[PDB]
Write a protein that binds this DNA or RNA. Structure first.
Lengths: 137, 137
DNA sequence: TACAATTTAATTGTATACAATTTAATTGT
DNA sequence: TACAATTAAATTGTATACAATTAAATTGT
């Protein structure tokens, strides 16, 4: 079959979840990944591009262009690290930081959909953390 | 509102991490993960319409038209207009596309092997994701 | 301590995803 | 006969993903 493949599942369910964020994220005028970078920025006003990649499991290949868009949109600003001219520093603009106020309804909203399943999702999450540690050395 | 505590993020990271596990295996068959998925449907069903593939794969022409074009150029599949509905398109396996099945034989094995390190049986993990998928749909 | 391995981003090239629009074919009573 | 409304792929425009390569800025011996 196909629905019996763990990889597929993770793959199609993840793309469906994203479609659920679409109406919400259109509100804030951002994409799901930009949104994920913001969840970081909101807990830490500034971060090296390296740090973001590490936490989101993406690399310069994605972040470089994605951070450019966010910058061109006014949600962030970027500058070279002065203690290490090799890395780049990403910082929230006032807007970027304010935008957090408008995204507080999201988790609960998504949950009002996902938890609509039936079993403890705090279980599924726990699993995925490990799986993630596995698949990530 | 910490990133690492979002089911949405976990599905997204884990999925792409699994896809990285397939890369070495699929590289030897000269295809990609999404291509591999369409072939899975094709090895079990000689002919499928673009529409049925979209349905089974949770995709639409947009991701499929370009992908199936590459596969056709790779000599894996044929694409002919349906006679029963000149609006539909039928996707058929080629001798080469068909032979390819055998070389993907122990891919599931290798995957399962490098992943069964979770804090529970895949039967549950899979069933969890299956439910979450059904819901979000 | 000169400077060859090493690291961090940007750059290149290929391949999804998906909304929105378009085009051609088919359908509801 | 008719057709407005659907429908199924393509197509257009934007936005990721990621491997490999490149370039510049630390590191380690």
């Amino acid at each position: 079959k196909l629905e019996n493949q763990l990889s597929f599942l993770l793959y199609a369910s993840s793309r469906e979840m994203t479609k659920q964020y679409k109406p919400l994220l259109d509100k804030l005028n951002i994409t799901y990944p930009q949104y994920l970078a913001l969840l970081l920025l909101w807990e830490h006003e500034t971060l090296t591009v390296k740090k973001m990649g590490e936490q989101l499991y993406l690399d310069s290949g994605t972040l470089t262009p994605m951070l450019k868009r966010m910058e061109q949109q006014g949600l962030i600003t970027r500058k070279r690290s002065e203690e290490d001219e090799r890395s780049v520093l990403i910082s929230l603009t006032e807007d970027g930081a304010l935008l957090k106020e408008k995204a507080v309804d999201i988790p609960g909203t998504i949950l009002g959909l996902s938890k609509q399943s039936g079993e403890d999702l705090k279980q599924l999450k726990s699993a995925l953390y490990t799986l993630l540690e596995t698949l990530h050395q």
